[PDB]
Amino acid sequence: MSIPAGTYLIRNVESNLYLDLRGSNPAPGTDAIVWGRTGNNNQRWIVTTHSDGTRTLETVGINSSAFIATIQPGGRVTGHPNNETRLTITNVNPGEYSISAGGLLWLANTPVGGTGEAVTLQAAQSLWVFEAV
Amino acid sequence: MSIPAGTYLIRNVESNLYLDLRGSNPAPGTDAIVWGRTGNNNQRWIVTTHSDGTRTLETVGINSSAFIATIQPGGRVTGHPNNETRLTITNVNPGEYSISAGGLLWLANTPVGGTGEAVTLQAAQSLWVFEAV
Amino acid sequence: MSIPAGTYLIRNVESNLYLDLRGSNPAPGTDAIVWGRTGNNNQRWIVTTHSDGTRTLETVGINSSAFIATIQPGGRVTGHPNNETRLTITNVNPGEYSISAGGLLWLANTPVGGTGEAVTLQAAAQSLWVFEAV
Amino acid sequence: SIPAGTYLIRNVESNLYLDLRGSNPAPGTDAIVWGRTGNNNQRWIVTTHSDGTRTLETVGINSSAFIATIQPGGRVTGHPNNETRLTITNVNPGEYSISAGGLLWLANTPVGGTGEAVTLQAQSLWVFEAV
Amino acid sequence: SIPAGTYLIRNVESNLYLDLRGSNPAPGTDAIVWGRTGNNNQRWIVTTHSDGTRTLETVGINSSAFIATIQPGGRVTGHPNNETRLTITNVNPGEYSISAGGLLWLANTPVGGTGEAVTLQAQSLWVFEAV
Amino acid sequence: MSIPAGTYLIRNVESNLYLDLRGSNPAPGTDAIVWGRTGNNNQRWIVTTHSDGTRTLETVGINSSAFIATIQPGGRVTGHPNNETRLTITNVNPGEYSISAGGLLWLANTPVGGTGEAVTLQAAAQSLWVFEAV
Numbered sequence: 001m002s003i004p005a006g007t008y009l010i011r012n013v014e015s016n017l018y019l020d021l022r023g024s025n026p027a028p029g030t031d032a033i034v035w036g037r038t039g040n041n042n043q044r045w046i047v048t049t050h051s052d053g054t055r056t057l058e059t060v061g062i063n064s065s066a067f068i069a070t071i072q073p074g075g076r077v078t079g080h081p082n083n084e085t086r087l088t089i090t091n092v093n094p095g096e097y098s099i100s101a102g103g104l105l106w107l108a109n110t111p112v113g114g115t116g117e118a119v120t121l122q123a124a125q126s127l128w129v130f131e132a133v
Numbered sequence: 134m135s136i137p138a139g140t141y142l143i144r145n146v147e148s149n150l151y152l153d154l155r156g157s158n159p160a161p162g163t164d165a166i167v168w169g170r171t172g173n174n175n176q177r178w179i180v181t182t183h184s185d186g187t188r189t190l191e192t193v194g195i196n197s198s199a200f201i202a203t204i205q206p207g208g209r210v211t212g213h214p215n216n217e218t219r220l221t222i223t224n225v226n227p228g229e230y231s232i233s234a235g236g237l238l239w240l241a242n243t244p245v246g247g248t249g250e251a252v253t254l255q256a257a258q259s260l261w262v263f264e265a266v
Numbered sequence: 267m268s269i270p271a272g273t274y275l276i277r278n279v280e281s282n283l284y285l286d287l288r289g290s291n292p293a294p295g296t297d298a299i300v301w302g303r304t305g306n307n308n309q310r311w312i313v314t315t316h317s318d319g320t321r322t323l324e325t326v327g328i329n330s331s332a333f334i335a336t337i338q339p340g341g342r343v344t345g346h347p348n349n350e351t352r353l354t355i356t357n358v359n360p361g362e363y364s365i366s367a368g369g370l371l372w373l374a375n376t377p378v379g380g381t382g383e384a385v386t387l388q389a390a391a392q393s394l395w396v397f398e399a400v
Numbered sequence: 401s402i403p404a405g406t407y408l409i410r411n412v413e414s415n416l417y418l419d420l421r422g423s424n425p426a427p428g429t430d431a432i433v434w435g436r437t438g439n440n441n442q443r444w445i446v447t448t449h450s451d452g453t454r455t456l457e458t459v460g461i462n463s464s465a466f467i468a469t470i471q472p473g474g475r476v477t478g479h480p481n482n483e484t485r486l487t488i489t490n491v492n493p494g495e496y497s498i499s500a501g502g503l504l505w506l507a508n509t510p511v512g513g514t515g516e517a518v519t520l521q522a523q524s525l526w527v528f529e530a531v
Numbered sequence: 532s533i534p535a536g537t538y539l540i541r542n543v544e545s546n547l548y549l550d551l552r553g554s555n556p557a558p559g560t561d562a563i564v565w566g567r568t569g570n571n572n573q574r575w576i577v578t579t580h581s582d583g584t585r586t587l588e589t590v591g592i593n594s595s596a597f598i599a600t601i602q603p604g605g606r607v608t609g610h611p612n613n614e615t616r617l618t619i620t621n622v623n624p625g626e627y628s629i630s631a632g633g634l635l636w637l638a639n640t641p642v643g644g645t646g647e648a649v650t651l652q653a654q655s656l657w658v659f660e661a662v
Numbered sequence: 663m664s665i666p667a668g669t670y671l672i673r674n675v676e677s678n679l680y681l682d683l684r685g686s687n688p689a690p691g692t693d694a695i696v697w698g699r700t701g702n703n704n705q706r707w708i709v710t711t712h713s714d715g716t717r718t719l720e721t722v723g724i725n726s727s728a729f730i731a732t733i734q735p736g737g738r739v740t741g742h743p744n745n746e747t748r749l750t751i752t753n754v755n756p757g758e759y760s761i762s763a764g765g766l767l768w769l770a771n772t773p774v775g776g777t778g779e780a781v782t783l784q785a786a787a788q789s790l791w792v793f794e795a796v
């Protein structure tokens with residue numbers, strides 16, 4: 001029904017690519033992309049539970065949290081050392097979840113020509129598997 | 134040593150004014166000011182504990198969290214429906230705490246001429262008392 | 267709605283004086299008074315929660331708990347190293363609570379002539395309290 | 401030590417149980433040892449405290465174990481609002497002692513068919529049986 | 532039901548205690564009822580499960596209560612890796628029954644001085660004494 | 663480092679097949695196999711944590727737990743309605759774990775001729791598993 005507290009690798013179902021903080025960069029504005037599996041810290045996301053049912057995601061060691069500065073269609077998911085966006089992670093199929101912020105679903109954008117693309121908010125076309133680290 | 138989980142009114146020691154979400158406005162960018170005591174929801178802050186020792190503050194009913202878009206000297210504390218800034222709430226004297234974001238201490242700005250002023254980050258001149266609601 | 271577990275300074279709203287174990291004396295029969303703010307151990311009260319909603323208060327380091335040997339109108343609140351009274355801490359206004367024992371509300375008595383006076387129980391809410399996290 | 405829970409508390413030396421005399425909820429009611437009944441006045445809720453101490457309260461009656469005068473010879477009673485912080489220390493596997501203010505509880509068997517209140521000594525072990 | 536904790540488990544009808552025969556940690560070791568010792572092979576850790584069931588494990592020996600064949604007459608044993616999910620239901624205040632697969636545990640008193648393994652019946656109550 | 667309490671689909675890395683209670687049969691002696699992903703109840707394993715670090719697995723709704731009647735090399739993993747084996751679930755790589763009973767690692771056996779084969783214990787880590795939250 002819900003994702004329990006723990007640390008996970010987060011794999012997009014449609015592309016088999018993993019949620020990835022670009023270059024493990026801890027600076028604000030660093031895009032959260034989907035990338036080939038590495039299992040490194042910038043692909044390990046700590047899931048923090050909140051009493052209202054929402055979730056927050058933070059990278060191990062880097063300590064940059066999933067953050068969206070402007071919650072509107074097309075807004076980009078980034079990593080931020082101090083700011084975080086409260087997310088709604090809802091089950092769609094057994095073992096497959098959607099992630100949304102402010103009612104807008106996360107859309108996985110596969111890399112193009114070797115350059116990763118930030119996850120964006122759509123106006124569920126992207127599902128995610130939460131694999132325990 | 135630390136502020137435990139709970140809902141609090143947060144009174145600035147130096148001015149006896151309370152942390153207040155301006156006009157109870159739930160929109161992003163709404164300033165967090167200090168204001169005369171009302172005890173209404175925009176002055177009731179839920180303190181959420183995190184395993185790393187940080188804290189996050191959310192208004193009751195309004196559900197806007199304490200959020201700082203740019204963590205630099207002079208940056209303003211606002212309320213945001215979906216975003217939140219992880220804070221460090223440290224004891225200074227018995228019953229008196231400092232609040233900081235990204236290592237920068239919160240500075241209480243008393244209202245001027247009837248207009249509230251947003252709490253800002255200084256480069257501890259502002260202490261806070263956490264009163265259980 | 268309720269006071270969560272923690273350690274608090276407890277200030278009387280009507281007088282801005284703090285719940286205070288007189289002279290920090292750990293002996294039985296030591297009055298719990300209201301006194302000027304100090305922030306010392308005899309003004310730090312550990313709030314212990316009970317499953318029925320009641321609360322118990324104990325001073326930090328001194329380890330003397332709020333205690334009422336005779337729960338009747340006029341009875342005095344003291345500190346006791348081994349005995350304690352289960353209290354009902356009820357919200358009256360946002361951020362302002364009343365304290366009662368056996369259904370009798372705590373009454374704050376301000377000092378007279380530089381001498382503190384014990385909190386007492388009023389007959390069957392003239393005193394309210396602010397719980398300030400230590 | 402004894403974990404949080406509700407127990408029947410039987411004295412080892414007598415096989416008699418901690419008993420709030422007559423299920424009387426008023427202050428001053430003696431805490432005695434009595435033949436087993438299993439009723440509410442023999443069901444003691446053990447509450448844990450972070451300093452390691454314990455407090456006991458009867459089920460439904462809501463009278464807690466209380467010692468007004470914590471000196472040798474003082475009597476254990478039940479009180480609807482007041483309670484005494486106790487130390488319940490393991491002596492043998494499955495057998496515990498109870499003390500208030502460093503003074504051990506002493507189980508007093510009935511004299512002439514009438515119950516006698518537990519007293520503090522300046523000798524009595526207890527088995528905590530989960531209700 | 533029985534809360535989580537470590538207990539000595541005494542059969543009411545015999546006053547004998549649940550006992551891992553000879554403290555033997557190997558599979559197939561009988562779970563018997565035996566005279567009180569208080570040793571590790573009589574200390575049972577009660578683990579709670581969200582469905583209401585319970586599992587028992589001996590302290591230090593780490594052998595859990597296990598029933599290979601859950602049918603009338605099946606024997607209760609200790610096993611280092613396998614365990615049987617049990618239902619421990621209150622019958623009277625302070626007295627519990629134990630069952631596996633809907634079949635009650637039956638305490639078997641020693642025959643000729645030798646312990647007899649607990650068996651499942653198609654009659655035995657237990658007191659959980661906190662260690 | 664460890665698998666937290668929850669309900670998981672458990673996929674074998676080397677074959678991308680999922681731990682599967684054959685035919686969802688709740689009877690004792692029913693093999694635990696690896697099978698094509700379905701997401702059904704017989705592929706949903708509740709992970710119960712134990713204070714010593716061990717773990718137990720139980721199918722949702724069917725209520726049959728992972729069980730090894732004979733813990734030896736070659737012994738088969740089954741589902742059992744009332745008996746269960748305490749397991750050691752150890753991290754090998756990030757996101758990839760091994761499962762073992764009595765110190766013997768679980769070995770995934772892929773189906774042959776459209777017939778599933780039971781997970782077995784290898785002699786004293788050829789099989790790894792991904793725990794996917796349901």
Ligand SMILES: CC(=O)N[C@@H]1[C@@H](O)[C@@H](O)[C@@H](CO)O[C@@H]1O
Binds near residue numbers: 024
């Ligand atoms: C080790 C490390 O930081 N790896 C990252 C990788 O995970 C991905 O984010 C990539 C984007 O160009 O940048 C780096 O190579």
Ligand SMILES: CC(=O)N[C@@H]1[C@@H](O)[C@@H](O)[C@@H](CO)O[C@@H]1O
Binds near residue numbers: 154155156248249
């Ligand atoms: C009830 C309500 O929203 N009150 C607020 C008050 O708390 C303060 O924020 C003020 C700033 O001008 O605006 C309103 O009056």
Ligand SMILES: CC(=O)N[C@@H]1[C@@H](O)[C@@H](O)[C@@H](CO)O[C@@H]1O
Binds near residue numbers: 288
């Ligand atoms: C440090 C200390 O014990 N201070 C106390 C103070 O808190 C108050 O109780 C006063 C009453 O006359 O007695 C002392 O000075």
Ligand SMILES: CC(=O)N[C@@H]1[C@@H](O)[C@@H](O)[C@@H](CO)O[C@@H]1O
Binds near residue numbers: 420424514
């Ligand atoms: C039911 C009930 O309160 N029974 C009590 C019993 O427990 C014991 O206290 C006895 C002392 O004379 O008085 C009554 O019989």
Ligand SMILES: CC(=O)N[C@@H]1[C@@H](O)[C@@H](O)[C@@H](CO)O[C@@H]1O
Binds near residue numbers: 550551553572645
């Ligand atoms: C210490 C120890 O294991 N003692 C056991 C005892 O508990 C009981 O199992 C008996 C059966 O013959 O065998 C031994 O004496």
Ligand SMILES: CC(=O)N[C@@H]1[C@@H](O)[C@@H](O)[C@@H](CO)O[C@@H]1O
Binds near residue numbers: 684778
């Ligand atoms: C729904 C159901 O029980 N499905 C199972 C499937 O999961 C697998 O175990 C297969 C083995 O032949 O048998 C059945 O079809």
